[PDB]
Amino acid sequence: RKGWKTCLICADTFRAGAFDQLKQNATKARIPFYGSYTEMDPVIIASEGVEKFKNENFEIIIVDTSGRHKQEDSLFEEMLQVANAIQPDNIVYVMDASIGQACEAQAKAFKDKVDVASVIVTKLDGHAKGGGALSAVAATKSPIIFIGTGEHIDDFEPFKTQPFISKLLG
Amino acid sequence: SVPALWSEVNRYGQNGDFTRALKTVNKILQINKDDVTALHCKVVCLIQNGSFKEALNVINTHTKVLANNSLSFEKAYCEYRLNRIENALKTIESANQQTDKLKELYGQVLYRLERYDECLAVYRDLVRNSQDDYDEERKTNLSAVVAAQSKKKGKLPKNYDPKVTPDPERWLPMRXXXXXXXXXXXXXXXXXXXX
Amino acid sequence: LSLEILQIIKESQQQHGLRHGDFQRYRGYCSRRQRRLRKTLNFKMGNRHKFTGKKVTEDLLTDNRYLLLVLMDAERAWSYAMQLKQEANTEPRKRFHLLSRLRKAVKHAEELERLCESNRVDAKTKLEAQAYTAYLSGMLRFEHQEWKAAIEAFNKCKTIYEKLASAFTEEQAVLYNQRVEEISPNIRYCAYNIGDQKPLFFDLALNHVAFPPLEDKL
Amino acid sequence: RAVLLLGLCDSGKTLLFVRLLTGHYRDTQTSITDSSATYRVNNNRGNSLTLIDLPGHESLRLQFLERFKTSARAVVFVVDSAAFQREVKDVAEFLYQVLIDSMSLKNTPSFLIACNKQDIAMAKSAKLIQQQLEKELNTLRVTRSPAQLGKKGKEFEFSQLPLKVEFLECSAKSADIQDLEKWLAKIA
Amino acid sequence: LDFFTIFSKGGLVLWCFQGVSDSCTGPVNALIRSVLLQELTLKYKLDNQFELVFVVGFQKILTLTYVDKLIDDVHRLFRDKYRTEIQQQSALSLLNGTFDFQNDFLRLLREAEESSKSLSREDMESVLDKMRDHLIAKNVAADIAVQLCESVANKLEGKVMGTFSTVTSTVKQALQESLVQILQPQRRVDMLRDIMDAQRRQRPYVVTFCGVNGVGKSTNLAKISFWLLENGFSVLIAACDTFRAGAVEQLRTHTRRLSALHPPEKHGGRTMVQLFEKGYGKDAAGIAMEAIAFARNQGFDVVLVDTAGRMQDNAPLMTALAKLITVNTPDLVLFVGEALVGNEAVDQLVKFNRALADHSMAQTPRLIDGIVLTKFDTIDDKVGAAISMTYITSKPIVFVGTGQTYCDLRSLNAKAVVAALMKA
Ligand SMILES: Nc1nc2c(ncn2[C@@H]2O[C@H](COP(=O)(O)OP(=O)(O)NP(=O)(O)O)[C@@H](O)[C@H]2O)c(=O)[nH]1
Ligand SMILES: Nc1nc2c(ncn2[C@@H]2O[C@H](COP(=O)(O)OP(=O)(O)OP(=O)(O)O)[C@@H](O)[C@H]2O)c(=O)[nH]1
Ligand SMILES: [Mg+2]
Ligand SMILES: [Mg+2]
């Protein structure tokens, strides 16, 4: 909507209905998408998708990955190999705003395996004030650029520090 | 032997065979024309075989023979079933002897005449004194009396004429049809979609 | 015709706050309840830049629906006073504002009992309104902090609500006996401080169609 | 040693605990802690048992059972016989835990199912209460979400256990506790 | 004061007052609100030293300041006048003591109607603060760890410590006992026995999976579909998630993966896992009612109703969810909450249970009947999300998900979760 030739890639080969999910979000918002029902390697979906949208001269190529936790070293190595195959200009750490004390440990282990440079805080439209974001800014060394404020595609806006600290304080 | 035709009407009314108890009752009404027990076994075989107007023509053709040995329930029941709730109400009240058969049909006649204050006192006494397999069906009848006080197509030949059937979509969201017809100026994000 | 006022107030409080003690939320549901009853039925009190007194007259009482408008005025001022009883435990001046909402909750219920005195309303809502007045007059004269004027309008509300139970079926008497039992604990406290000094309907008459005893016929 | 009184709420644990110590009827409420008192047994030697009445509430039934099960010489599982037919699911479920806390002990204590409240006309017999719990602990050992009950290939019974399991009938309203004081004198 | 009963904690009425008028009305409902449910206004006062409870029944809640001064003087005259009967361990000191406190109470009542016209909490102060800061850091809700800690300065105040005890180890121990008894909800569960009882009317067993966005409702619904098939049960997955993209293909991959492990050939010849779907955008109470009538007609022992994830503050949508669970009457409402959520575990279940009872139109409304604690393999000991959930709700943690596959479904080890949380 700002004028960029944006496109999506679904590099999730594990979650059920994950390419069907991003396909129906991209079909609705009129955005090109890439992914596979059949490919089981996310390094292969993400390399062959950024290669296709490079040769089509897109300016914003957003690669979606599966959910992973730090105690799974198998998914943390696969995340590092998806990041090494496509070599992303920016890595965004999306965190739920209802996360408790377990936030600083996961957010730090994401910064250690992969180079996180921006943080996004979703599910802030409800009761959660999002105090877990102080522990993912200190762990990933990355600022918050956007917040999510609902389930729809337009429930999305840039992070402003003053209204988030006034809500976090009361 | 009419005692052997009555062990045959008895053996067919026990097995639920009111089609053959009605052929064996019409063999006792050929020898005994005014048999009041064979004019009651025939009215039951016609109420059970769904002839309520043929069972009401067996009661009205023999009004003097079935007199005071009457079928005032099978007569107020055939009329209750032929859309006569004013004749089914007059035959329950004019019955010479009141039973628990005319009390069960009278709880269903009061409910049809929308007399729910008398139908509640009839169905309160019917749930107390009745010991049968239909006590869960008589607490659903009393629970409906308490809840009561409180292919046309425009034309058929024009169906297979224009384009054998209407548009294949043919009824669905109006905004989903190939016609659209919603005067839509643009798309906006209100509800869930994603098709 | 009919109005089950006690069932109306009890299921609107448990659904809109009073199950967890939210009188501020129950009153706000009462005010939005009345605004939307007023905007639907085109019964606005004021217009822009002027105000005109809402007078629910007798002609519009056939709807069986405008009694809920005045009752939502009685339940709004009642819900505000019970919220001011919780805020008067730390702000004892709030009690003066509490007692001004309870004198206008009986005045709405005394004006709603006079409306039910119309002949277009059955013998059920005249008497639910007569003894909803006598219940709010016993709670105001209980908050007067006089224990005698409290048992006088509670034993009046109990004797009214019990006179209504005896007169009809014991199934419809349940609503009036549920309300004598509802205000009965408050009467034991003021007596402790006076003497201190198509539905599914079955055709069960088709199972009764059976043969006569065929023992004499063999 | 100790004889723990267990069961659901309102089974009659504290009124049998009163009827054995005083022989009288005492008004009781819901117990939130345990209560202990000595009981001079009816036999010749007059042995002394420490009756322990444990709360029947289910925030406190297994917290006190695990505390005193190591000190238990016998356990009396008190059953509400009148209200047995609607509580068949909570009696057999609590009794399943008392059965595995029992065989897992070094010296397995002696076990009784005191079918209380027989003075009520609707009290089920200790023979119907043993049949419906053998049928219920047979479904429970399969449906339970390693010590097991009896044999897996056979229908469960209280005779298949390595425990001294008995059934008697009593009443805590004087009272009818004669079979209870005869078993309390026999295990003393 | 219309009522006053003083019994011990062993459930033994010592003395009771109900007025000269009749007598002895409501001493059992008085005990229930005052002692049973705490571990006419009916409140209480606990003597924890000698195990006493002082339950009182009064009205006009504004007279609570003089009712509390009357329980304090009655508590001071009772524990002094009968100190010999109530200080002994034997329950035969209270069975054999005579508590004739009627003339002493009529004097303390008539005299309090004229005013109207060991272990202290200072010792236990510092250790209740180190235990509250340990529960909060181990992911117990901030206020759950404050009521937990105050339930323990009450329980041990007056009580004498053991032969080898400190101030620290006493409040640290009775906090573990008030934490295992609250993590022991007043509920139980079963298996094939429970579907034999759902067959007393010849009908399936319908479970409703509700919860907030992303907790694991659909993935643990598939772990329980594999756990029901493993017990020989046929399960019909009702797909009532019509508010998202790929919410039906997610459940259709679970039904393809489960009808591979449990096919008709390896089950007897009949379909055992089948998806009931009506597309997206449809009503979630209409697809659910069609799947209960479809599993009845096609012989499915279980219906597992998957609903969409939603927030806790949505009046037009927690209305449609509370009306769904009220009207559909599911056999077990299973709230799905992750073990990663912090203080929100209290607000989710309180608004989820307040909605289910508000937008319900029954006398006793259908509330959440259990909890599924997912993402348990992610906290690693920060386990206080299991305490925050079974604290407010007196409902059990029916399952604990410990991964993403069908085999990572556990029962709750609630004893070692309080032992890990109360050890600091
Ligand atoms: N590690 C771990 N992951 C889990 C667990 N339970 C669920 N998940 C993961 O959490 C994610 C959420 O999956 P999903 O089942 O769609 O959650 P949901 O609540 O149905 N989301 P929605 O609100 O859209 O319906 C999945 O990637 C799933 O694998 C668990 O116990 N452990
Ligand atoms: N009729 C009858 N009543 C009994 C009998 N035994 C106990 N009761 C009554 O049942 C009520 C409950 O008895 P309790 O002794 O408190 O049972 P409990 O198992 O200790 O209950 P909890 O303290 O909650 O564990 C008491 O008020 C008794 O009067 C009995 O044998 N017959
Ligand atoms: Mg994904
Ligand atoms: Mg007890």
Ligand SMILES: [Mg+2]
């Ligand atoms: Mg889902």
